[PDB]
Amino acid sequence: SNIVVSTRTGEVMRILPRMHEDINEEWISDKTRFAYDGLKRQRLTQPMIRNEKGLLTYTTWEDALSRVAGMLQSFQGNDVAAIAGGLVDAEALVALKDLLNRVDSDSLCTEEVFPTAGAGTDLRSNYLLNTTIAGVEEADVILLVGTNPRFEAPLFNARIRKSWLHNDLKVALIGSPVDLTYRYDHLGDSPKILQDIASGNHPFSQILKEAKKPMVVLGSSALQRSDGTA
Amino acid sequence: DNSTYRNLQHHEYSTYTFLDLNVELSKFRMPQPSSGRQSPRH
């Protein structure tokens, strides 16, 4: 969601929403609004290296970069690896990609799990929200599999609530009976119901059959549980 | 005729007269129409 950062004398003061009719309209979640406080606490400000006692002590940029480059030169190939966090930009990601490519390494891993079997990440639409956040306003039935969008993507759930209020959109959930701020048809909890809907036995198959603009949304949290492929 | 007041009948009304009369009339009413949903929040 688009925001405006309000500063004063080089210090962050607050986060305000910014209008994008297609992403967040006019709202931002409480985490987005109030988690800027942590940017002034527990911060890493200087390079650090391990000393003889084994503790982390401050050192200059040259020392730390040279000590890293020594091991980067000494090892090669599969012996080097990388892990990407949750708040990383594309520029740093591609920089790390090129840096480990110059060492003949492909072990670029991310904490989040996405099943790579078959298409994997080769086809982009295999891991996107192809309906888009705005397009939720045009759907007439939505199926949610193993998600709690109220907390995983609050503005997505807000858009779903708006479409539920204005377009009589019908929601069904496969997962724990969470509170989504609107009434939904709880099909059940066990994942096998998906196969049942795949078989055609469960009446929600008939429900999705008659819809002009159906929608199925799957979250990555349900892809973490080692059954992501299935 | 006019000398007598003929509206003494309310002088012995209890706190539950209205509700009891509503319960008595409940079986005289036509079926209510339906909005299609059980609540506006549904």
TrEMBL record, chain A:
GO molecular function: 2 iron, 2 sulfur cluster binding; 4 iron, 4 sulfur cluster binding; metal ion binding; NADH dehydrogenase (ubiquinone) activity; oxidoreductase activity, acting on NAD(P)H
From-to range in the entire protein, with total length: 259 to 488 of 727
Keywords assigned: 2Fe-2S, 4Fe-4S, Acetylation, Electron transport, Iron, Iron-sulfur, Membrane, Metal-binding, Mitochondrion, Mitochondrion inner membrane, NAD, Oxidoreductase, Respiratory chain, Transit peptide, Translocase, Transport, Ubiquinone
Superkingdom field: Eukaryota
Keyword Lipoprotein: no
GO cellular component: mitochondrial inner membrane; respiratory chain complex I
Function: Core subunit of the mitochondrial membrane respiratory chain NADH dehydrogenase (Complex I) which catalyzes electron transfer from NADH through the respiratory chain, using ubiquinone as an electron acceptor. Essential for catalysing the entry and efficient transfer of electrons within complex I. Plays a key role in the assembly and stability of complex I and participates in the association of complex I with ubiquinol-cytochrome reductase complex (Complex III) to form supercomplexes.
Name this protein carries in UniProt: NADH-ubiquinone oxidoreductase 75 kDa subunit, mitochondrial
Family note: Belongs to the complex I 75 kDa subunit family.
Localisation per UniProt entry: Mitochondrion inner membrane
GO biological process: ATP synthesis coupled electron transport; mitochondrial respiratory chain complex I assembly
Keyword Cell wall biogenesis/degradation assigned: no
UniProtKB/TrEMBL annotation, chain B:
Superkingdom in the source lineage: Eukaryota
Compartment annotation: Mitochondrion inner membrane
Similarity annotation: Belongs to the complex I NDUFV3 subunit family.
Subunit structure: Complex I is composed of 45 different subunits. This is a component of the flavoprotein-sulfur (FP) fragment of the enzyme.
Known function: Accessory subunit of the mitochondrial membrane respiratory chain NADH dehydrogenase (Complex I), that is believed not to be involved in catalysis. Complex I functions in the transfer of electrons from NADH to the respiratory chain. The immediate electron acceptor for the enzyme is believed to be ubiquinone. May be the terminally assembled subunit of Complex I.
The name this protein goes by in its record: NADH dehydrogenase [ubiquinone] flavoprotein 3, mitochondrial
Organism per entry: Sus scrofa (Pig)
Residue numbers of the full-length protein present here: 69 to 110 of 110
